[PDB]
Design a protein around this ligand. Structure first.
Ligand SMILES: [Mg+2]
Ligand SMILES: [Mg+2]
Ligand SMILES: [Mg+2]
Ligand SMILES: [Mg+2]
Length: 58
RNA sequence: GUUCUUCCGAGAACAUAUACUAAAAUUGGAACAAUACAGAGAAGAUUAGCAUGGCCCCUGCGCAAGGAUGACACGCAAAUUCGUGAAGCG
């Protein structure tokens, strides 16, 4: 019988790869996109119809 | 060891703790080249390719991509339990 060509009847699980569960388990090889980028965080301006002021604004 | 003190051969200050310390002696752990054999995924054959899984790697700068689809998988799969009437006995 053929059985190697099977789908995922069994559930997928994870949470144990490189650097998961312990921060020292990151290898010093890191991916090209793991470079620091977009490091200045944007925020929404003051008076953006913020929730409490919006609530007031019935 | 130096700049100074003098009663004279001593005194004050400056200077302040190197080194996985070995020229060694010991003790684990990987792949190498090839005589003969029989030889590489899918209900006949030629057989794609891409997936899926874990206490399996290798090449790669790599969330790219290759390594036979990289290899494997390839059936006792029972795993919460019964219910019935004939005929021997005794
Ligand atoms: Mg093929
Ligand atoms: Mg591949
Ligand atoms: Mg190939
Ligand atoms: Mg594969």
């Amino acid at each position: 019988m053929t059985t190697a060509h099977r789908p995922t009847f069994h559930p997928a699980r994870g949470g144990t790869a490189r650097g998961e569960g312990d921060l020292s388990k990151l290898s010093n090889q890191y991916s090209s996109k793991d470079m620091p980028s977009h490091t200045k965080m944007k925020y929404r301006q003051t008076g953006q119809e913020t929730e409490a002021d919006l609530r007031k604004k019935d």
